[PDB]
Design a protein around this ligand. Structure first.
Ligand SMILES: [Ca+2]
Ligand SMILES: [Ca+2]
Length: 173
């Protein structure tokens, strides 16, 4: 079983609400109570992929996630339509906050990421640090689109903090 859990305030903070998978709009939500600008943050575990839609009727800027979205995105100022569909379970990785696995963690499924969603998809510009792959290998790229120097994390690294300069793009192999 699965269920996406949103948050009322940004930063994963603010009252939360669990919503079962499937496709719905402001209609179903009207039945619950939450609607419009409220999904400030999001926590979606693996096994199921979620897709948000700003304007109702599944329209307006759309988002896609499978893990826990911290900052969510820029359109967090308006939400109502969403769509989630069961997805095959796959391993992933885990990044901590404070330098020394002493800060909230964030997971990210396999795949590549840029410098825009990545940050606003799990953490932010600079704040990752200590990393810990829960199954696959993580690779950090300094410059944008996986370019410039790189820090291939082919193993556990509960302590990186001051190392490069600012992880821009990444790739979980
Ligand atoms: Ca925010
Ligand atoms: Ca350290």
């Amino acid at each position: 079983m699965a269920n996406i859990t949103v948050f009322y305030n940004e930063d994963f903070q603010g009252k939360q609400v669990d919503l079962p998978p499937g496709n719905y709009t402001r209609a179903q939500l009207a039945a619950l109570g939450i609607e419009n600008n409220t999904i400030s943050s999001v926590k979606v575990p693996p096994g199921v992929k979620a897709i948000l839609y700003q304007n109702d009727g599944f329209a307006g800027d759309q988002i896609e996630v499978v893990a826990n979205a911290e900052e969510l995105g820029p359109l967090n100022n308006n939400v109502s339509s969403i769509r989630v569909i069961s997805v095959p379970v796959q391993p992933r990785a885990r990044f901590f906050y404070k330098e020394q696995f002493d800060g909230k963690e964030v997971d990210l499924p396999p795949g590549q990421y840029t410098q825009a969603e990545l940050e606003r998809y799990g953490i932010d510009n600079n704040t990752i640090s200590s990393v810990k792959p829960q199954g696959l290998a993580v690779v950090l790229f300094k410059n944008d689109n996986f370019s410039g120097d790189t820090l291939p994390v082919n193993s556990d690294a509960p302590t990186l903090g001051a190392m490069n300069n600012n992880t821009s793009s990444i790739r979980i192999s």
